[PDB]
Every structure is written in structure tokens, then in C-alpha cells.
Amino acid sequence: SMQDPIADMLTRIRNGQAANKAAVTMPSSKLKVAIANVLKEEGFIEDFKVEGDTKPELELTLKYFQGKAVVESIQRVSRPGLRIYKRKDELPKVMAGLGIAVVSTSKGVMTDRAARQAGLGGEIICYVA
């Protein structure tokens, strides 16, 4: 069974970057758009779109740079078997600041850099380095 529909979103990115896929398609969700919005404003993916009325279907336009993948590493952290919460001074750094860590804070999902500024921590989603 699909226990973890967010780890499949990161897996389908990670697998498509190694296959030089122009785009990856997947089922849509409310949580998948908020992750794919942080993935575009921070710059890792070029575009995202969602089509469908009864059952929507998201589609990420994957991004490449000079012949290699922009998403260099993408990892699940707070899996269904182990949840990870950090206070606002316990927030992780990924690649010494040269890579973001998508966090679920109470004012919407944002990055870790934006969540230190808000003065509030949250559940860590993933490391997109």
C-alpha cells in the first residue's frame, strides 16, 4: 500500500533527474502543491501545474543546468515510522546553508530560512540539497 505519498513525490523527482526526464507527472494534493511551491520559489524546479476535476494530476517541469540535475539530493526525513519536530532554535542546516530544508510551520509550509525569521519551528518535511 502507499503509506507515504510525499516520499513518492521526492522519489519521482529523484528518479526523473537521473533519467533526464523533461517533466514528472504524479497525482495532486493540497500538501503536494505547498511543497512544489517551495521547490519553485527557491529555484529548484522551473514550473508546476495541476489539471483535473474529479481526480487532479500534478506535473512538475524538472530543471537541469549545464547537463546535470539541479536537484542534487532529495531525502525524506519525517517518515510515517518516525516523526521529526524541531523548536525554532533546533532547526537543521542542510549543506551549511547552501541547501534548503522544507519545514511545515503553522503559517503554512515554508523553508527553514523563512521559519527562523518567523520565530516559530515546525515539522521538517525533506532535505532538498
Binding site: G43, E72, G97, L98
Partner: protein, 156 residues
């Protein structure tokens, strides 16, 4: 400018109809004092002819490392076949906290302040390959500005 260090020298053998025949592997590493680092491997019947070949094969297949001031830019890992290797940036005062063949490839590289650890095998041949593997995928504060179409100050 090409400074040089030889790491290990070991005697190998080979059985024939007559008997056993010996020969000498010699493992080096080179580097100038900034990001260009290389290494070579030569094998011959006699040791001065085999440190010759390894130091000759080291002066080519040099590779660039985007150095920071005297150190790394972020934590990084590197594997080659037996040896997983961790090395970590540091601040001016702690020196090369490393060891083995991992120490020598770090001296001629141009880097002076590391924290580091060797896990797995510490075969000196493979562990110089797992540390070049870790230095080569260390990415600068401006190659990530180029990658996401950004300026460095928006990344800090």
C-alpha cells in the same frame, strides 16, 4: 609549485614455473597549494623506478577543488569501494584533524583546517579515492547561485 607526497610502498609477488617474482607498488598524491589535487600509482621491479611512475602519473589527471579560504564549504562525503569518508569545514586554529592516507591528500590540496573521519576500510589505495571523491563534489557559494538562477546574498 607542485608539492609532492608519497603515501605507501608495498611489495607484491607472482608465482611462475621457476618461483616467486617480486615487484613494488608505490602510491603518491600531488597538489600545488590550491584546489588542483592529483595522485598516481606505479608498479615496477625496483622502488625508484616505481615512485617515478606514480609521481609521473600524478602530475596529470589533476582535478579542481573549489576551495574556500583554507578549508571546506560544507560537510561532504565520499566513497570508493571500501572506504566511506567524512570531512567537515573548520575555523582557523584546529589544523588537519585527519589521518592515514587521508591526511596526505589533504595537505597538498591547499586545505588547512578540517575535521574528518574514515569509516569502512582503511586500505590506503581506496581511501585516497574516497577523499578525492569527496573534494570533487564540493560546491561553491556561486555554483549554487548559478544553479537556481540567483544571487549569493539571497542564499547567504
Amino acid at each position: 609549485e607542485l608539492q609532492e607526497k608519497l603515501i605507501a610502498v608495498n611489495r607484491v609477488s607472482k608465482t611462475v614455473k621457476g618461483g616467486r617474482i617480486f615487484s613494488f607498488t608505490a602510491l603518491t598524491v600531488v597538489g600545488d597549494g590550491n584546489g588542483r589535487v592529483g595522485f598516481g600509482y606505479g608498479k615496477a621491479r625496483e622502488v625508484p623506478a616505481a615512485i617515478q611512475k606514480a609521481m609521473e602519473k600524478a602530475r596529470r589527471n589533476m582535478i579542481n577543488v573549489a576551495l574556500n579560504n583554507g578549508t571546506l564549504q560544507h560537510p561532504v562525503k565520499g566513497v570508493h569501494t571500501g572506504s566511506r569518508v567524512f570531512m567537515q569545514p573548520a575555523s582557523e586554529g584546529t589544523g588537519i584533524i585527519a589521518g592515514g592516507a587521508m591526511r596526505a591528500v589533504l595537505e597538498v590540496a591547499g586545505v588547512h583546517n578540517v575535521l574528518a573521519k574514515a569509516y569502512g576500510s582503511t586500505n590506503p589505495i581506496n581511501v585516497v579515492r574516497a577523499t578525492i571523491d569527496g573534494l570533487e563534489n564540493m560546491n561553491s557559494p556561486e555554483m549554487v547561485a548559478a544553479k537556481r538562477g540567483k544571487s549569493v546574498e539571497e542564499i547567504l
